[PDB]
Enzyme design. Structure first.
Site, PDB file in Angstrom:
ATOM      1  N   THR A 195       0.866  -1.198  -0.063  1.00  8.70           N
ATOM      2  CA  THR A 195       0.006  -0.073  -0.093  1.00  8.70           C
ATOM      3  C   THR A 195       0.813   1.267  -0.099  1.00  8.70           C
ATOM      4  O   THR A 195       1.980   1.292   0.515  1.00  8.70           O
ATOM      5  CB  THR A 195      -0.817   0.152   1.209  1.00  8.70           C
ATOM      6  OG1 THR A 195      -1.848   1.195   0.864  1.00  8.70           O
ATOM      7  CG2 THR A 195      -0.069   0.344   2.426  1.00  8.70           C
ATOM      8  N   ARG A 196       0.217   2.198  -0.486  1.00  5.80           N
ATOM      9  CA  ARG A 196       0.803   3.487  -0.699  1.00  5.80           C
ATOM     10  C   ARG A 196      -0.151   4.749  -0.241  1.00  5.80           C
ATOM     11  O   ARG A 196       0.232   6.012  -0.493  1.00  5.80           O
ATOM     12  CB  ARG A 196       1.252   3.944  -1.988  1.00  5.80           C
ATOM     13  CG  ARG A 196       0.340   3.393  -3.084  1.00  5.80           C
ATOM     14  CD  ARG A 196       0.929   3.918  -4.516  1.00  5.80           C
ATOM     15  NE  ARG A 196       0.354   5.135  -4.931  1.00  5.80           N
ATOM     16  CZ  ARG A 196      -0.787   5.058  -5.175  1.00  5.80           C
ATOM     17  NH1 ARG A 196      -1.733   4.018  -5.381  1.00  5.80           N
ATOM     18  NH2 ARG A 196      -1.575   6.090  -5.439  1.00  5.80           N
ATOM     19  N   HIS A 200      -8.489   2.697   4.733  1.00  5.47           N
ATOM     20  CA  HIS A 200      -9.670   2.923   5.208  1.00  5.47           C
ATOM     21  C   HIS A 200     -10.396   1.528   5.473  1.00  5.47           C
ATOM     22  O   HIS A 200      -9.804   0.499   5.619  1.00  5.47           O
ATOM     23  CB  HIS A 200     -10.677   3.551   4.146  1.00  5.47           C
ATOM     24  CG  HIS A 200      -9.775   4.916   3.765  1.00  5.47           C
ATOM     25  ND1 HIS A 200      -9.724   6.081   4.524  1.00  5.47           N
ATOM     26  CD2 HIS A 200      -9.342   5.210   2.772  1.00  5.47           C
ATOM     27  CE1 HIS A 200      -9.004   6.878   4.165  1.00  5.47           C
ATOM     28  NE2 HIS A 200      -8.803   6.496   2.826  1.00  5.47           N
ATOM     29  N   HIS A 203     -10.073  -1.631   3.264  1.00  7.20           N
ATOM     30  CA  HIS A 203      -8.694  -2.150   3.365  1.00  7.20           C
ATOM     31  C   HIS A 203      -8.429  -3.193   4.561  1.00  7.20           C
ATOM     32  O   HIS A 203      -8.188  -4.186   4.475  1.00  7.20           O
ATOM     33  CB  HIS A 203      -7.809  -1.194   3.396  1.00  7.20           C
ATOM     34  CG  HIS A 203      -7.808  -0.344   2.292  1.00  7.20           C
ATOM     35  ND1 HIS A 203      -7.193  -0.441   1.130  1.00  7.20           N
ATOM     36  CD2 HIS A 203      -8.422   0.913   2.104  1.00  7.20           C
ATOM     37  CE1 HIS A 203      -7.770   0.475   0.172  1.00  7.20           C
ATOM     38  NE2 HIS A 203      -8.229   1.512   0.924  1.00  7.20           N
ATOM     39  N   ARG A 289      -7.667  -4.769  -6.905  1.00  2.21           N
ATOM     40  CA  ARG A 289      -7.918  -4.217  -8.074  1.00  2.21           C
ATOM     41  C   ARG A 289      -6.906  -3.026  -8.433  1.00  2.21           C
ATOM     42  O   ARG A 289      -6.443  -2.420  -7.643  1.00  2.21           O
ATOM     43  CB  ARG A 289      -9.306  -3.625  -8.069  1.00  2.21           C
ATOM     44  CG  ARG A 289     -10.126  -3.409  -9.214  1.00  2.21           C
ATOM     45  CD  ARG A 289     -11.135  -2.406  -9.132  1.00  2.21           C
ATOM     46  NE  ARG A 289     -10.535  -0.895  -8.845  1.00  2.21           N
ATOM     47  CZ  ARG A 289     -10.290  -0.286 -10.067  1.00  2.21           C
ATOM     48  NH1 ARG A 289     -10.817  -0.548 -11.160  1.00  2.21           N
ATOM     49  NH2 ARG A 289     -10.073   0.967  -9.875  1.00  2.21           N
TER      50      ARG A 289
HETATM   51  N1  LIG Z   1     -11.462  -1.789  -3.070  1.00  2.00           N
HETATM   52  C1  LIG Z   1     -10.415  -2.636  -3.290  1.00  2.00           C
HETATM   53  N2  LIG Z   1     -10.723  -3.871  -3.800  1.00  2.00           N
HETATM   54  C2  LIG Z   1      -9.691  -4.729  -3.771  1.00  2.00           C
HETATM   55  N3  LIG Z   1      -8.553  -4.523  -3.536  1.00  2.00           N
HETATM   56  C3  LIG Z   1      -8.296  -3.130  -3.346  1.00  2.00           C
HETATM   57  C4  LIG Z   1      -9.095  -2.209  -2.956  1.00  2.00           C
HETATM   58  N4  LIG Z   1      -8.546  -1.324  -3.001  1.00  2.00           N
HETATM   59  C5  LIG Z   1      -7.180  -1.109  -2.662  1.00  2.00           C
HETATM   60  N5  LIG Z   1      -6.805  -2.663  -3.030  1.00  2.00           N
HETATM   61  C6  LIG Z   1      -5.685  -3.439  -2.950  1.00  2.00           C
HETATM   62  O1  LIG Z   1      -4.896  -2.698  -1.920  1.00  2.00           O
HETATM   63  C7  LIG Z   1      -3.363  -2.814  -2.276  1.00  2.00           C
HETATM   64  C8  LIG Z   1      -2.659  -1.444  -2.169  1.00  2.00           C
HETATM   65  O2  LIG Z   1      -3.773  -0.435  -2.392  1.00  2.00           O
HETATM   66  P1  LIG Z   1      -3.366   0.884  -2.747  1.00  2.00           P
HETATM   67  O3  LIG Z   1      -2.379   1.626  -1.712  1.00  2.00           O
HETATM   68  O4  LIG Z   1      -4.618   2.180  -2.820  1.00  2.00           O
HETATM   69  O5  LIG Z   1      -2.505   1.032  -4.317  1.00  2.00           O
HETATM   70  S1  LIG Z   1      -1.310   0.366  -4.356  1.00  2.00           S
HETATM   71  O6  LIG Z   1      -0.645   1.388  -5.365  1.00  2.00           O
HETATM   72  O7  LIG Z   1      -0.425  -0.041  -3.397  1.00  2.00           O
HETATM   73  O8  LIG Z   1      -1.668  -1.019  -5.242  1.00  2.00           O
HETATM   74  C9  LIG Z   1      -3.317  -3.458  -3.566  1.00  2.00           C
HETATM   75  O9  LIG Z   1      -3.261  -4.675  -3.920  1.00  2.00           O
HETATM   76  C10 LIG Z   1      -4.596  -2.896  -4.054  1.00  2.00           C
HETATM   77  O10 LIG Z   1      -5.327  -3.585  -5.308  1.00  2.00           O
HETATM   78 CA   LIG Z   2     -11.676   1.609 -15.593  1.00  2.00          CA
END
Ligand SMILES: Nc1ncnc2c1ncn2[C@@H]1O[C@H](COP(=O)(O)OS(=O)(=O)O)[C@@H](O)[C@H]1O
Ligand SMILES: [Ca+2]
Ligand SMILES: Nc1ncnc2c1ncn2[C@@H]1O[C@H](COP(=O)(O)OS(=O)(=O)O)[C@@H](O)[C@H]1O
Ligand SMILES: [Ca+2]
Ligand SMILES: [Ca+2]
Ligand SMILES: [Ca+2]
Ligand SMILES: [Ca+2]
Ligand SMILES: [Ca+2]
Ligand SMILES: [Mg+2]
Ligand SMILES: [Mg+2]
Ligand code: NA
Ligand code: NA
Ligand code: NA
Ligand code: NA
Ligand code: NA
Ligand code: NA
Ligand code: NA
Ligand code: NA
Ligand code: NA
Ligand code: NA
Ligand code: NA
Ligand code: NA
Lengths: 510, 510
Positions: A195-196, A200, A203, A289
């Site tokens: 995650t970056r 919430h 998650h 996703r």
């Molecule tokens: N609503 C969601 N449904 C399924 N997976 C999610 C959802 N939101 C975030 N994720 C997953 O949570 C992980 C990290 O999310 P983010 O911090 O937003 O983005 S990421 O750039 O690190 O992938 C990733 O595997 C991402 O696909």
């Molecule tokens: Ca799209």
């Protein structure tokens, strides 16, 4: 699982007894020195601690091109993201193979000694297209053409010390340290969550579901190295993570900060992330996703399919040697007050709800009220505090060039006018005199929440020194944020336009 | 600092390669087995992990007596608390020197192998007087005469594994692990804080002042092994500690649980605690007022002087090899809203405030409101939740033997009456039939907040099986908690007396 390549390449451990020696060489007046760029500091740290096993230095042309066109190192090892040492022509010209370069941090702390294998000039267009999919707006591509050096220096490393960090000393666990952490706890099944962004409610549920599905403990492994431009700084996110970790049942999750420099390379990065998490001791890795995806470009088109990463990871499944827990869109169910994977509902028989990141900033910038179901209160509090609503944000009004009125009197008028509003904001007439040492301070004030009244524009050759964030141009021009009727419009009139404009954009609330 | 004795006696590390062998011997049908008592499990864990260095087993008579009369091991090493393996005559008779005993936990988990050096019968009166000061109400003395075995078995240990714990797996750090913790953080100065009570505002200030005085990081090292009878359970305290740790500036404090079995031996224990914390990696140890003291006896006299511990620790100063940060009574200053050592104020020129532990329970039991200045809100919440006010407490009414009325009808009357009050309390007519398997369940219900109506007393030979907590006797006797007028007093009358008694004692609130 066994570190990628079979051997954890912890060079700090490996080179321990050469510490003093290497340190002496690194500071010898004869050796050539290169000061590591920010992204390089992130990469160098993952190489020296074993996070990038089997890597033991920056990719030479042979391994580099094999990764660009084959998603593998020259020896066949699965590796999707090219890790190279990019330098400029001037520096590149001073080195030949067999040469030893001292790599420093802040032109002061010697990090490692790189023994040169080769110096080449990559075709950035191929790397851009084959590795990041070619779109010029893609974060990795923009970096590659606007920040990265045009020459790469392949070579092996000898560690002196991992890059210096004064924040979160206890949390930046190395692969070796994390593994010990898990062991002391007898954790043999651990699903890691990349995650970056701040976490919430969705998650939290996603990660717990994974812990339950995999029958494993949870590892929150956020990136604090370098992410997508415009992301929430890591300090705020760490505060959010430490806060949300408390919503997990006692002793089910562990937090560790990953000093990784992301490329926002969707599917390729997902593969890369999994390899990295395996090196760090995880037995499972989540891939939701649009994993590691940078969303859409200015035209509204996706940089990656919402599930490309999952597909790519699935196809390397048998050689990743770390189990992937895939997730489809996790959304909210009003009528049942709970979240759930979108792949196991819908049918219209149930109504869902989703507050995209976009919409999220909007409330944060407009003082909106973020739903109790969306995120925890303690989390939003931390977020609002780091990204205050407009009424607490800073800004600048630049008196355009076309201005015919007295810039001095118009400045005073605006100052006196803003001062009577009150609200804790600090104001100042700011004369930059085209001096970059003053220009570079503009965003600092804005960041501090202050309002700046700038009587003159800065020469176009310096426009780059100033962040355009919350900087408005008062001018008769069509490209003026606050357009004037005439260049000699009377002050009270101009003042009213500026006040009402700022009021309309939420900076002022009465 | 160097572990006490110079060598950290981490026997788990030492005996690692003998693990399988010792385990086989421990489970061989021929070896003699002893199931460790609770306090022994605490001690055995501190011996095997090096926390009791230089100890490597339970004291033989030579070392034992040297500690009782000399506060030193036979070899002169400073050691104030005797750590022995107490057993009964029956078991003592089956062993001779050179014998090997298998030490188990829960008659199932083999902990270690003890090689017998001797079996002696200590004079508990001397140990009681020389080590614990003689008062029969002293916790260590009452344990020594009512729980401890009358025979001690001196002998050396060979570790199989530390005692099993399923709660807080990550927090019970061993000396070796803590030292690594501090190192990974580059902590070379750490002041440890001992405790068996929940931390309130005074303590937070006390510990921070110490961090500032010693120029060292803070180590909250609470006891979760065994403390003073009636203390707050460790689960609650851990929740409190984890909560209060957040009130420290980021990265200044570390939490680690110590599975120590205190003796509440004031000054001697203080010395012992310091030695223990030194073994664990601390460079400083706090010693406040009445450190490790059990307060006063039933006569109102002090078991130890409020500063005996500080004096004793001071006199061993040059050989403890760990710096002691002494503190005098830390109290509250209303007029200035802040705490401060009592030794640097008073003069009457300033008014102080202090909410003793006594007064603390009173509010907790009476639903009182604990001052914002005294403790943090989040902390009191956790405390009230574990020690609910009377209106949420359980209780029992025992129909005395002298009762002439129908016990069956009086029981129903009480039940039906309590039921109409409502308030979430669960009620039950409980017939024990003098069966200990039923009697031992009485406090369980009371602990669960339920109200029990017991129609008959239990034979005096079983009175020990029942905790007297919130158990009231309804009888004509003078020793009845709720005294009746006559043995045949009419039910409605008895009912009113019981209801009003419970109402007067806060169990019911209308
Ligand atoms: N609503 C969601 N449904 C399924 N997976 C999610 C959802 N939101 C975030 N994720 C997953 O949570 C992980 C990290 O999310 P983010 O911090 O937003 O983005 S990421 O750039 O690190 O992938 C990733 O595997 C991402 O696909
Ligand atoms: Ca799209
Ligand atoms: N008001 C105080 N002033 C000075 N020291 C204190 C005060 N309260 C507690 N302490 C110190 O805090 C440490 C642990 O306190 P407690 O948990 O109450 O009891 S103890 O049995 O572990 O000493 C001891 O060093 C004790 O003396
Ligand atoms: Ca270029
Ligand atoms: Ca005009
Ligand atoms: Ca006895
Ligand atoms: Ca006293
Ligand atoms: Ca009568
Ligand atoms: Mg570092
Ligand atoms: Mg244990
Ligand atoms: Na493996
Ligand atoms: Na410098
Ligand atoms: Na699996
Ligand atoms: Na696709
Ligand atoms: Na494999
Ligand atoms: Na508008
Ligand atoms: Na059993
Ligand atoms: Na005596
Ligand atoms: Na000192
Ligand atoms: Na005394
Ligand atoms: Na010393
Ligand atoms: Na009364």
């Amino acid at each position: 699982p066994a570190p990628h390549g079979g051997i954890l390449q912890d060079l700090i451990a490996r080179d321990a007894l050469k510490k003093n020696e290497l340190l002496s060489e690194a500071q010898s007046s004869d050796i050539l020195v290169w000061n590591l760029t920010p992204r390089q500091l992130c990469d160098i740290e993952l190489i020296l601690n074993g996070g990038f096993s089997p890597l033991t230095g920056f990719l030479n042309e042979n391994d580099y091109s094999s990764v660009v066109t084959d998603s593998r190192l020259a020896d066949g090892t699965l590796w999707t993201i090219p890790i190279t040492l990019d330098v400029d022509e001037a520096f590149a010209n001073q080195i030949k193979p067999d040469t030893r370069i001292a790599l420093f941090q802040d032109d002061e702390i010697p990090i490692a000694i790189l023994t040169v294998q080769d110096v080449y000039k990559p075709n950035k267009t191929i790397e851009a297209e084959r590795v990041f999919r070619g779109d010029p707006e893609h974060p990795a591509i923009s970096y590659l053409f606007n920040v990265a050096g045009d020459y790469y220096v392949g070579g092996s490393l000898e560690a002196i010390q991992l890059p210096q960090h004064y924040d979160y000393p206890g949390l930046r666990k190395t692969p070796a340290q994390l593994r010990l952490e898990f062991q002391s706890r007898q954790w043999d099944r651990v699903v890691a969550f990349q995650t970056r962004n701040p976490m919430h409610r969705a998650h939290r549920e996603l990660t717990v579901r994974a812990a339950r599905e995999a029958n494993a403990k949870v590892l929150i492994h956020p990136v604090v190295g370098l992410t997508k431009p415009g992301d929430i700084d890591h300090h705020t996110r760490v505060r959010v993570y430490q806060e949300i970790i408390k919503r997990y049942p006692n002793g089910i999750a562990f937090l560790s900060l990953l000093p990784l420099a992301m490329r926002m390379s969707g599917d390729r990065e997902a593969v890369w992330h999994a390899i990295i998490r395996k090196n760090y001791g995880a037995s499972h890795f989540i891939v939701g996703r649009d994993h590691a995806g940078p969303g859409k470009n200015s035209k509204g088109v996706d940089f990656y399919g919402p599930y490309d990463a999952q597909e790519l990871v699935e196809s390397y499944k048998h050689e990743l040697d770390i189990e992937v827990v895939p997730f489809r869109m996790v959304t909210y169910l009003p009528d049942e007050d709970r979240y759930a994977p979108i792949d196991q509902i819908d049918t219209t028989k149930t109504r869902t709800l989703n507050i995209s990141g976009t919409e999220l900033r909007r409330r944060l910038r407009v003082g909106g009220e973020i739903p109790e179901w969306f995120s925890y209160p303690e989390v939003v509090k931390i977020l609002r505090e780091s990204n205050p609503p407009r009424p607490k944000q800073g800004f600048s009004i630049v008196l355009g060039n076309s201005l015919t009125v007295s810039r001095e009197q118009l400045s005073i008028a605006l100052l006196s006018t803003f001062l009577q509003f009150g609200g804790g904001r600090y104001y100042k007439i700011f004369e930059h005199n085209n001096k970059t040492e003053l220009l570079s301070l503009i965003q600092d004030f804005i960041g501090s929440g202050s309002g700046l009244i700038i009587p003159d524009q800065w020469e176009d050759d310096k426009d780059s020194v100033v962040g355009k964030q919350n900087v408005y141009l008062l001018d008769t021009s069509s490209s003026a944020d606050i357009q004037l009727e005439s260049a000699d419009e009377p002050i009270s009139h101009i003042v009213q336009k500026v006040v009402l404009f700022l009021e309309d954009n939420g900076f002022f609330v009465f």
